Amino acid sequence: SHDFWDYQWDMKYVTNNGESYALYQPSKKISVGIIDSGIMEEHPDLSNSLGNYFKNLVPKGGFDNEEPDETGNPSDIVDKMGHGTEVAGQITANGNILGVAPGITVNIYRVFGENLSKSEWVARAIRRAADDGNKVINISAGQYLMISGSYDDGTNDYQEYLNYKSAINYATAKGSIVVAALGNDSLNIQDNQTMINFLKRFRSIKVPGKVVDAPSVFEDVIAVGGIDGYGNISDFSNIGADAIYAPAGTTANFKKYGQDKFVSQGYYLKDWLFTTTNTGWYQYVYGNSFATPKVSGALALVVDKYGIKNPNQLKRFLLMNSPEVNGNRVLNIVDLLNGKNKAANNRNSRGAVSVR
């Protein structure tokens, strides 16, 4: 039935080795809107999960006209990268691998072509996903914004921040919750000097100001970081005191041993996670982009099971029913379902949204 379940250490971790699946089966009324690189609709583990709502938000020419292949056709949600298909599998795969919520409806909002994205596109996608009735919206992508102080040009990134804020407020008004990946840069988001030092590698800063990891920073958003198979924060994961963590894997052994040994000695089997990709088959991946959908799918199960209509109530419920490992709240779907407690230009250039 599920040939590759045994490879899914990360799914076993959050489901109590499959226990959660038997506890609840979602209706067709709930969906997750996936704001990402699109999807391979014909993937055998995913095709039966596809909902009826979708939109391509990538403009003609893609990221600042570097992508002549991007047409701007609003119906073109094909995944050219793999990332969106990999994220989707974590939510809803129902076949050779299992997502957290197998077969739950997913609707697809494409904001990447083959490289980078823009907050303008992501904000439009958030609004569209909310308008289409997706009560949970997954954003496995982000960017750092310096929202005070100034770059050499005298400005900062506050306008982009405000544009996200408006979109998120709108989603909230519509009754949707947004779940977003923390970055994979090993940054404690509360340590501003360290974030400034990071930005100085990629930007020209004149007067340092407050740096945020957006859109995960917003109070109403559920920020998701990564743990490895030991339950420790992933080496690559940013750290947020108000985040929840779920399995994202680790690059610690890759970095120590190098690619040849990483592969030949099988480190990837436990260090990286096995998911659906746009070949029609599978790939090992890592990153907070793959923790985020575990939380999104779990939240969608809760929304459906308990008929939770208030997103404010929903976040409170999640945090109260997520156990602590080493001082960090981690996703546990059995606990959540049981609900014991009732409620040069670069990837980090200004304006560049990147996958996590």
Give the helix/strand layout:
Blueprint: H1 9-15, H2 19-23, E1 31-36, E2 50-56, H3 83-92, E3 105-110, H4 119-131, E4 136-139, E5 141-146, E6 150-151, H5 158-174, E7 177-181, H6 192-199, E8 205-207, E9 211-214, E10 222-227, E11 244-247, H7 252-264, H8 268-271, E12 273-276, E13 282-285, H9 292-306, H10 311-320, E14 324-325, E15 328-329, H11 333-338, E16 354-355
Parallel strand pairs: 1-3, 1-4, 2-3, 4-7, 7-10, 10-11
Antiparallel strand pairs: 5-9, 5-16, 6-8, 12-13, 14-15
Helix pairs in contact: 3-9, 4-5
PDB class: hydrolase
Keywords: alpha and beta proteins, subtilisin-like, serine protease
Assembly: monomeric
Number of helices: 11
Q: Percentage of helical residues?
A: 25-40%
- The CATH topology is Rossmann fold
Under the CATH scheme, which architecture would be assigned? Answer: 3-Layer(aba) Sandwich
Share of residues in strands: 15-25%
- Given helix and strand content, the structural type is alpha/beta
Largest sheet: 7 strands, parallel
Shape: globular
| Whole-number count of domains | 1
Strand order of the largest sheet: 2-3-1-4-7-10-11
CATH superfamily: Peptidase S8/S53 domain
Run of helices and strands: HHEEHEHEEEHEHEEEEHHEEHHEEHE
Radius of gyration: 19 Å
Number of strands: 16
CATH class: Alpha Beta
Question: Terminal Cα separation, in Å?
Answer: 31 Å
PDB class: hydrolase
Keywords: alpha and beta proteins, subtilisin-like, serine protease, hydrolase
Assembly: monomeric
Entry title: High resolution crystal structure of the nisin leader peptidase NisP from Lactococcus lactis
